[model samples]
Target: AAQTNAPWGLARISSTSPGTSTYYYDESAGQGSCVYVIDTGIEASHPEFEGRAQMVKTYYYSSRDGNGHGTHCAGTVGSRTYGVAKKTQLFGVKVLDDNGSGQYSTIIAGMDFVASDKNNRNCPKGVVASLSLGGGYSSSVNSAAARLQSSGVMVAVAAGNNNADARNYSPASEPSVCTVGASDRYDRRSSFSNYGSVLDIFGPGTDILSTWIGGSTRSISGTSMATPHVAGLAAYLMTLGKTTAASACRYIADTANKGDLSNIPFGTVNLLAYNNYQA
Candidate 1:
């Protein structure tokens, strides 16, 4: 389907990006894949979700989101109105509370739940989890994320908003997950986005527009936003039969639009996430 008047981030991730303001994507782009939005939980009733979003697990009080961060990230991943994977299923795993903060123990528990759930389903589609939150280095969190990879779940994590090395961040610095940094409409690294050798790729992150709590929309920016774009693309790739986490990550990096973003820190791959769509 051709999505007109779409967000610039949408237009920037497809066929020869910057080619048009109209965003073109396959109607089946994310069929048979699932993205676990591991954050503060999603507002599942948002109109854009069309009932595709749900809260499967929560470490907090309820799946209901008082914080808008997770809703925005989930919308970018699979909401019909703004998502990258229009056909993917979205499951909210609330690792953080409404205030958008959580302990590493709870966060790691969320990861454990994701792997356990994926294993239980025993389905055929690819499984991808989006981690739009993170903190300083923690071996526990890193190991938990690594376990997700071992379980065949593709994972995408935010590099952080500090504009520092991603190496200092826990799950984001983990080698097994796709570490995403932010880029803007101008093809420059987002000034506040963390950078470094650990980052896997860049995604349109500056001032991204997406669904919010209570069925509204908001424009926000950060590696948090960037991470979901990569997650959405992972779902999209999975629909095309790149089923494994390793294969999906490889396809994403290999097919990404390169040499685009400016002001990237040295050693960071100048790779911008792409969907490889047609004109």
Candidate 2:
């Protein structure tokens, strides 16, 4: 199986962060916090995340591990050596199977587990759920996304890879979800990335590099890659005690470079600037 999209030779902020070690140095290192990566399960032992990531638990709707999309997404969020929140813990919900697909109900169930999984001790009392998956339209998504957002659990979702005018499925399109789209290294939205009023922000998504299954590495292109960039940043902010999802969203949104209007979403606002958290 191969992706039909053309490789746009460019690195993204989410994939090739300009200053990771330096960024984490000035910002809080996800020391006491964690993020729940709801996608395919990650190989927690991958060198980039080896020792750094603690997989509190994993839930699988499928039988085996074949497709590595989930793993790649996980690496982007918390792979030790290469991830954005290397110091943060990651919990994987394998709703999608080897085929890179899963039941919407199953994925929703996984979100439930993150919101109220007492068994997952590594996750602080409040767990931030990172969802890089999306399907078609779903009403359940609104209720679910709203509930989680109201509960102080940040649900980060990918806008869509289809380049459609509006957002995609249940979770991503839900207003409560912090929907993310992809931007290339040059700050241009990927030609394949969807654009609409629902998109909340942009992240590094073009030719993004990260860990794959079995400790290998590769680059992928999608809003999927960008979602985790914000997720990881949220987790990093969480460690700084910035608990509100909206607050985290504000931080990243305020920091991004909005060069020109064309690269941004139609109804979305541009990132102006940010002041350091008073704390």
Candidate 3:
């Protein structure tokens, strides 16, 4: 299908990353699944979580969300009222500080903890790590994602918000990871979204509404918001017995809506991660 500039009805297409068009009513939508958000931290007390969120570890900061970025992303990943997989277990692996600043090593430390299941008592079932932070390309982070995927932990990363080619960034440039770019409710590439082949897929990111600190909700933008949508989609796939991280990535790519990004990044078309699951 060709791309269009028609206005979108609801920006919650961000909510449709897991499954849209038709709804899947599973009491345990993402039961037996886990998503480790590698960002600032998660406000575990946030009501949207219903207490299903856990702080497995923290790397350079307290295990509480001070910037609200992590909590917001976590909400999009697994909150009951504003998420892709409402029942998926959420874990906060704080890599960035309260101000959302961190060294690349911080990201690796968080990945190492979850990949090794450090103190998680071998987190049973499928695991997906949501990373919404990035810098220039880093070999260490790329290697870390590969190692985690080798252990069956899917890693989803942001394609950056520089509005440039994502190939010039870290985790997004990592071939082993699922790199996501931002799209709007209108199905057009977001103004701040990075493009090019490094981006594996696009997801709703503009004006995305999700849980925030202070037991509230807020709308935000950036490829950071888009990445969690894909992360949650990965978690949804985990619940359906797609245990291997590499396989899950392949399936997501194979099943995405193609030919919809031609106008945005002409001659560099990629997939749009739409809701395709049913039953």
Candidate 4:
């Protein structure tokens, strides 16, 4: 069981943030937030999550994490070592099949399910929906994200790995969602990251280590990997009174360290997403 000295994304924000002695390390460690990881599914029993991860439902088939993508994203969102919201409850809403295939409608269905569960599960603060999957534009998912945002749910989606303008992607193109791009350990945009005005922010997506399937860990790369960092940070913002999607997005953009990265355009700054909410 080895862990990195620090998650590079967090380090880029503040070397001491989410550190043992920081307020965000414990006080706002996503205590009242439920981050819904909508992907392949999750290994709810993974040791890294310490039982905080649980599968709530599946749109296509059983909610078992056979592919490990969901689990990896979940780990980055809430695992004790790799997460930003170390104490948040993780609910898995599996949209993709074990073969990594899923329809756009299935993703929308999952969003609907998570939105419904927000109240039933008693998460008064709100929920953060982390989506690591994406393709072409889908008005259905974009509309769903607008509805969910209206209801206080924060949606963080990957901007895709196409190396093209993210404005061409579905949820990423949707302004309501926090569209995340990929940055490397050096805090520069990953060569494969899609960039554009529609892309909201960037996070460490290269060589990111997190929980894998079958009770293990692995390092992965993609805008998919970058997205959970933003999702976890969004959940942490909830504890600090950034409940609404608008407020959370604004605060993150405002407080972000744009100078940490080199040559990023003003429209889409690669925010070093961090935690350590000091009251």
Per TM-score, the best of the predicted structures is 1
Model 2, runs deviating above 4 Å: 1-27, 54-64, 123-126, 259-262, 271-279
List clash counts for every candidate, in order: 0, 4, 0, 0
Number of the candidate with higher TM-score, 2 or 4: 4
lDDT over C-alpha atoms for residue 62 of model 1: 88
The clash tally of candidate 2 reads 4
User: What is the C-alpha lDDT profile of model 3 across 1-279, one tens digit per residue?
Assistant: 111221121223323432233233344567778899989899989989998898878875378888999999999888876777778889998889998998888788778888887346444557888999999988888888777767778889999999898888988899878888887765678899998887777877788878899999888998999888888887776686654566777777777777664347764456777545443
lDDT of each: 0.88, 0.65, 0.77, 0.78
| TM-score against native, each model | 0.97, 0.82, 0.88, 0.90
| lDDT of model 3, residue 212 | 94
Better of 1 and 4 by TM-score: 1
Strongest candidate by lDDT: 1
TM-score (C-alpha, index-matched) for candidate 3: 0.88
How large an RMSD does model 4 have? Answer: 3.3
lDDT of 1 by residue, 121-240 (tens): 533678999999999999899999999888889989999999899999989889988899999988889999998999999998999999999889999999899889999998887787
* 10 residues in a row with least lDDT, candidate 2: 1-10
